[PDB]
Design a protein around this ligand. Structure first.
Ligand SMILES: COc1ccc(C(OCCN2CCC[C@H](C(=O)O)C2)(c2ccc(OC)cc2)c2ccc(OC)cc2)cc1
Ligand SMILES: [Cl-]
Length: 507
């Protein structure tokens, strides 16, 4: 039995270093631990066991167990669709970067190009105020012509538009040895990172928590929700992951590797990246902060520099973007296949040709993020939709059902499935810990919050936060509303009616 490169993906190589550097330093690692043992493994285990016992995923599995709580599935399908639209945008930039890599001299290493301004200094070749770097000018002026403000959307970058079209075609065909390659590249990047001048200075910024700043709830809601973005929890795919098992699989001991090892790659990625930020500081005499960007560009401003600071730069630059593209496509294939499970809901009745309709709709809708100033709407797509509060609230209801509306009986089913009984701490976690911690964090965020800013300079207008609230509600308001559809369509008498909607089916 083996799983190869399953845990490794874009969820810990691109997102985790982004969030760790933005919110702060090593202080972010404390909420990443308390949200891991408690609000982590128990939910993953619950989802996997529920998907394995019922032998079905999506929404019908939640129809069988607590038919009243059928709206959970609809919430997980909408958020998956929201993720599918923008997750492919990241793969467009990698295609563009790989496209102009087949050359003797890398374009993101020298000064004097048309897009470059007069303030660039070609460092490492023989401080100075108002100075920038050539690497950042290949991100802020060439791939994405950033426009001041969200009001001005400007024109559309046609070069990036074609790259997105390729990504869709490559995978519209996906749905008509290897898998060890990413680890080698990660090791190579890590080796070239720690053995650099000033590397140890950056590490202390990463492994020394800065307390007294935990009062801000932003550090507390990004952590935990990042864990939920990883592990693929609350995305409506884990409930189908266990459907392929053989009903006699040791589910508890099964994830203990995946339940833990997937968090063992984020630490190594942080080691590899945060060591580079110390180098750029030792080269420009600047704080460990302000060397790069706090938004979703760090993975495209830190790696290309490390690759440049290495012999045979083009050859290694070609392969890194290849592994990024491969991981992104592999992650997108599964997330696009599950949404087409709408067949079970509508009994595409027989033939699933709606994949073509989904791709065309998703392509045209996603063209907004590729226009001038498209990153500004990207943050609103990543801090409120498919992240932030959209997952915490769903998880509070994820299953107080298994905890209160179904615990002891489920443990009997688990013992029947695997043979023995898991420790009783998980049951108490389900009962009181996860729905308690998540509710506390939710109330903390809603009682005292700070407006979100793009890399801590630019603040969105009122309508940006309005659209963020709209897109966040569009996934969390389905569960309370769906009870009004289920109840009030049955007999009607509340006491007698509540009983039927709660009795599970004949599993
Ligand atoms: C890169 O290649 C893959 C990596 C993980 C997966 C799984 O989720 C994919 C969901 N995506 C959410 C945002 C980005 C995450 C990331 O890219 O990391 C993952 C997966 C899901 C459903 C499956 O059956 C239908 C099978 C696998 C996954 C998730 C967690 C896990 O254990 C922690 C193992 C597999 C699949 C391919
Ligand atoms: Cl993570």
């Amino acid at each position: 039995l083996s799983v190869a490169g399953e845990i490794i993906g874009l969820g810990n190589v691109w997102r985790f270093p982004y969030l760790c550097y933005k919110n702060g330093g090593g202080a972010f690692l404390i909420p990443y631990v308390v949200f891991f043992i408690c609000c982590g493994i128990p939910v993953f285990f619950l989802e996997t066991a529920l998907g394995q016992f019922t032998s079905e995923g999506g929404i019908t599995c939640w129809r069988k167990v607590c038919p009243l709580f059928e709206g959970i599935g609809y919430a997980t399908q909408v958020i998956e669709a929201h993720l599918n639209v923008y997750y492919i945008i990241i793969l467009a930039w990698a295609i563009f970067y790989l496209s102009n890599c087949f050359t003797t001299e890398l374009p993101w290493a020298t000064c004097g190009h048309e897009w470059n301004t007069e303030n660039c200094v070609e460092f490492q070749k023989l401080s100075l105020q108002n100075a920038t770097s050539p690497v950042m000018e290949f991100w802020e002026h060439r791939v994405l012509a950033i426009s001041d403000g969200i009001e001005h959307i400007g024109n559309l970058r046609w070069e990036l538009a074609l790259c997105l079209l390729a990504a869709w075609t490559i995978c519209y065909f996906c749905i008509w040895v290897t898998a060890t390659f990413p680890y080698i590249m990660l090791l190579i990047l890590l080796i070239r990172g720690v053995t650099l001048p000033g590397a140890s200075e950056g590490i202390k910024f990463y492994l020394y928590p800065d307390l007294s700043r935990l009062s801000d709830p932003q550090v507390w809601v990004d952590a935990g929700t990042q864990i939920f973005f990883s592990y693929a929890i609350c995305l409506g795919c884990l409930t189908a992951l266990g459907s392929y098992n053989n009903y006699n699989n040791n589910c508890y001991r099964d994830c203990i590797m995946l339940c833990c090892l997937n968090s063992g790659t984020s630490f190594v990625a942080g080691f590899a990246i945060f060591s580079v930020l110390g180098f750029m500081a030792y080269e420009q005499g600047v704080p460990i902060a302000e060397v790069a960007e706090s938004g979703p560009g760090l993975a495209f401003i830190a790696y290309p520099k490390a690759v440049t600071m290495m012999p045979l730069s083009p050859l290694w630059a070609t392969l890194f973007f290849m592994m990024l593209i491969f991981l992104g496509l592999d992650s997108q294939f599964v997330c696009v296949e599950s949404l087409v499970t709408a067949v079970v809901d509508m009994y595409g009745y027989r033939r699933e040709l709606l994949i073509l309709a989904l791709s065309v709709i998703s392509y045209f809708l996603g063209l907004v993020m590729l226009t001038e100033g498209g990153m500004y709407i990207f943050q609103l797509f990543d801090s409120y939709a498919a992240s932030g509060m959209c997952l915490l609230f769903v998880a509070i209801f994820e299953c107080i059902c298994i905890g209160w509306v179904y615990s002891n009986r489920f443990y009997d089913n688990i013992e029947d499935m695997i043979g023995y009984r898991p420790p009783s701490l998980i049951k108490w976690c389900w009962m009181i810990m996860t729905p308690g911690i998540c509710a506390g964090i939710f109330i903390f965020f809603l009682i005292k919050y700070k407006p979100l800013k793009y890399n801590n300079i630019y603040t969105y207008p009122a309508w940006g936060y309005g659209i963020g609230w709209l897109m966040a509600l569009s996934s969390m308001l389905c569960i309370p509303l769906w009870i009004c559809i289920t109840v009030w369509k049955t007999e009607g008498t509340l006491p007698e009616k509540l009983q039927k909607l709660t009795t599970p089916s004949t599993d």
